[PDB]
């Protein structure tokens, strides 16, 4: 038996970390680029599967 891949997943950091609140998203940009890095890493993992 040998695993070949797991379930592909993608996380929208903005929606998950803020939700409906637009002000919380409007405060997220102080962190600059964490959301972009996380989304890019998850996309790279997903295409790898």
């Amino acid at each position: 038996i040998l695993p070949v891949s797991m379930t592909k997943t993608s996380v929208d950091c903005t929606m998950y970390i803020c939700g409906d609140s637009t002000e919380c998203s409007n405060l997220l940009l102080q962190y600059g680029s964490f959301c972009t890095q996380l989304n890019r890493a998850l996309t790279g993992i997903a295409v790898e599967q």
């Binding site: 993608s10 929208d12 903005t14 929606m15 989304n39 996309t43």
Partner: protein
């Protein structure tokens, strides 16, 4: 960055020309419509009659 979907694809990257492929350019959420929901019915009538 809001003209054509191809323009948004260009804006997500930093290139004026994009080759073959698929890229997540934005995330969309269904904005709820303007309606509310009700409450439980009155147990009894007014104690004034």
């Amino acid at each position: 960055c809001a003209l054509d979907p191809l323009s948004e694809t260009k804006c997500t990257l930093k290139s004026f020309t994009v080759e073959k492929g698929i890229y997540q350019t934005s995330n969309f959420r269904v904005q709820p419509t303007e309606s509310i929901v009700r409450f439980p019915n009155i147990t009894n009538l007014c104690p004034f009659g």
